[PDB]
Symmetry: C2
Subunit: 174 residues, 2 copies
């Protein structure tokens, strides 16, 4: 039941592309994207092919303009379904310094402000012990977004960020 439909023009009009599961490059089918329907599941959609560039998380729902998924523009060319481990457990460790060094804070809860709750301005490495998470640049879940699946992130470039700026994070729940 999980799939997403990208449309070239506004309000679900024009040429459309369907993805049922991880589509690594659809630019030959759609030259831009100005509408999206997420029929099921939760999806990361990426600006550049092979899951590169600016990403955006979209849960199930309809998005009649690119600004409705917070997109900065109408460029998308790849996407992968978000897989939720079952059990439903979320637990993360965030680190002051790279390679799991320095201050370290563990939580199972969402964090709309790292500053208020942990008195850090930056994250430099991460361990996702359980679940799937999103790192956001600005607080309260705004700005650039990064997807963090169950792994280890020795450095910010491992969640695909060019700086260590992280001010909020939360769980991916459906």
């Amino acid at each position: 039941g999980t799939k997403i439909t990208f449309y070239e023009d506004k309000n679900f009009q024009g040429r459309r592309y369907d993805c049922d599961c991880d589509c690594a490059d659809f630019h030959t089918y759609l030259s831009r994207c100005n509408s999206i329907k997420v029929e099921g599941g939760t999806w990361a959609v990426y600006e550049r092919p092979n899951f590169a560039g600016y990403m955006y998380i979209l849960p199930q729902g309809e998005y009649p303009e690119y600004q409705r998924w917070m997109g900065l523009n109408d460029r998308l060319s790849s996407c992968r379904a978000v897989h939720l481990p079952s059990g439903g457990q979320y637990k993360i460790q965030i680190f002051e310094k790279g390679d799991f060094s320095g201050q370290m804070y563990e939580t199972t809860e969402d964090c709309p402000s790292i500053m208020e709750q942990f008195h850090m301005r930056e994250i430099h490495s991460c361990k996702v012990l359980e679940g799937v998470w999103i790192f956001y640049e600005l607080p309260n879940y705004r700005g650039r977004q990064y997807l963090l699946d169950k792994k280890e992130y020795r450095k910010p470039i491992d969640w695909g960020a060019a700086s260590p700026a992280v001010q909020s994070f939360r769980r991916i729940v459906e």
Copy 2:
């Protein structure tokens, strides 16, 4: 083509379409398929959209003509990666009667001839205790193909068949 690449004309000429995993319908981009590159893994490909109609299993390799995958014709519309569970375990039970009743045989090995090894030509229900298998209408893996992921099959229709007519089966190994 990160996992499987379909081509409209023979010998990898013509329009092409890539599926990275699970594609429910590509008939809008390909009117027919005359050759296939399987860059990795093992793929189930289906004549009609949404995984319907004739199916064929394609291990890793290159296929310059539809006959090279036992195709009846050059009509293909959807595909699905086959998932091999961890362990390397393969066990199946085949039943003379529908719904797991009647005489039962159980094997861990490929059977190129149901008539020779089990003195019948008709499987009527079965249990895949381990692994994933293929069923064929004719001996020695020829003719029509049917995929069985690890589950229960109380009636031939559960594996997509229109009759109990099965004359060989084997394991999906890479």
